[PDB]
RNA sequence: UCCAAGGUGAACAGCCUCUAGUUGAUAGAAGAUAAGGGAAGUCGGUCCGUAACUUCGGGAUAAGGAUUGGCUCUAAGGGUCGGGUAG
């Protein structure tokens, strides 16, 4: 990364796996002009719309999640396993 | 010789009911258990607590909460248009 001049590594799962901000302090990339005319209102543009655009994921987020294997026995066991856990995150303190 | 509902049974079975048929058969009155001994007899004694898993399609392209951008070569990847200074 130090090679090709980045000041962050891309989200990779060898990224995150076997290994953030290389120039210590950040630049922000809502400052960070595309100076191309074109795409400098189109960045602007999807800048507006970055709620949309995150909800149009989350829910998307939320319908991968109902269509997984058994998705409804997962909820279930999350439940169970939520249950217990915050009964006994008070039982052992008191 | 023909037709042939459902539920439990969760082992053909048995039990109960729906549609449909019966109330026929003179009427009235008044096997089980057992203390102690133990053959002394006789011919002859499916349901409560775990964990991993687990079904169909569509998707190709390394992942799928995150900052997605993802190899080399190899047919096509919607159409069109547009290039200077001087005489």
Do not use: C, H
Request: glycine share 2%; proline share 4%.
């Amino acid at each position: 990364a130090k090679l090709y001049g980045l000041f962050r590594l891309p989200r990779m799962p060898e990224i995150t796996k076997y290994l953030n901000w290389l120039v210590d302090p950040p630049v922000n990339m809502d400052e960070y002009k595309y100076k191309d005319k074109k795409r400098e209102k189109e960045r602007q543009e999807t800048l507006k719309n970055i709620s949309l655009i995150n909800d149009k994921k989350k829910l998307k987020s939320e319908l991968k999640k109902k269509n997984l294997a058994w998705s409804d026995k997962t909820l279930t066991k999350e439940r169970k396993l939520e249950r217990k856990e915050k009964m006994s995150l008070k039982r052992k303190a008191i």
